From Swiss-Prot:
Tissue: Highly expressed in testis.
Quaternary structure, from the entry: Component of some HBO1 complex composed of KAT7/HBO1, MEAF6, ING4 and BRD1/BRPF2. Component of the MOZ/MORF complex composed at least of ING5, KAT6A, KAT6B, MEAF6 and one of BRPF1, BRD1/BRPF2 and BRPF3. Interacts (via PHD-type zinc finger domain) with unmodified histone H3. Interacts (via PWWP domain) with dimethylated and trimethylated 'Lys-79' on histone H3.
Cross-link Glycyl lysine isopeptide (Lys-Gly) (interchain with G-Cter in SUMO2), where in sequence: K41
UniProt name for this protein: Bromodomain-containing protein 1
All copies of domain Bromo, residue ranges: 9-113
Function: Scaffold subunit of various histone acetyltransferase (HAT) complexes, such as the MOZ/MORF and HBO1 complexes, that acts as a regulator of hematopoiesis. Plays a key role in HBO1 complex by directing KAT7/HBO1 specificity towards histone H3 'Lys-14' acetylation (H3K14ac), thereby promoting erythroid differentiation.
UniProt-annotated location(s): Nucleus; Chromosome
Gene, per the UniProt record: BRD1
């Protein structure tokens, strides 16, 4: 139908906007601490601690399959990256501190993204 196409064009444009959001959040991680999945070869007990692992490469795969229906779903995944790290790693670690800085800096990007998503519809 024409409606399914219109719906598909909206999803494509959301994907375009979320790709730009993702790039901007990932620049706030210059150490690439959150770029890839935590390695289960190197951290073999990880899944005993963290039930829903997440990372930027995994988000990008979902994004490029148009797997985020709305900004809320995308934010859920970003928040998993931060929150998983802050549980697994102690406060005095470069990993925890990296997550705090990513959360704080990402807040600004996500604030305007929400306005843009509502505004453009």
């Amino acid at each position: 139908s024409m409606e399914q196409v219109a719906m598909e064009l909206r999803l494509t444009e959301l994907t375009r906007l979320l790709r730009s959001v993702l790039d901007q959040l990932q620049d706030k991680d210059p150490a690439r601490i959150f770029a890839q999945p935590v390695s289960l070869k190197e951290v073999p007990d990880y899944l005993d601690h963290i039930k829903h692992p997440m990372d930027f490469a995994t988000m990008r795969k979902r994004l490029e399959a148009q797997g985020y229906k709305n900004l809320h779903e995308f934010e859920e995944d970003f928040d998993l990256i931060i929150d998983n790290c802050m549980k697994y790693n102690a406060r005095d670690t470069v990993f925890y501190r990296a997550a705090v800085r990513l959360r704080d800096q990402g807040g600004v990007v996500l604030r305007q993204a929400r306005r843009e998503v509502d505004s453009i519809g």
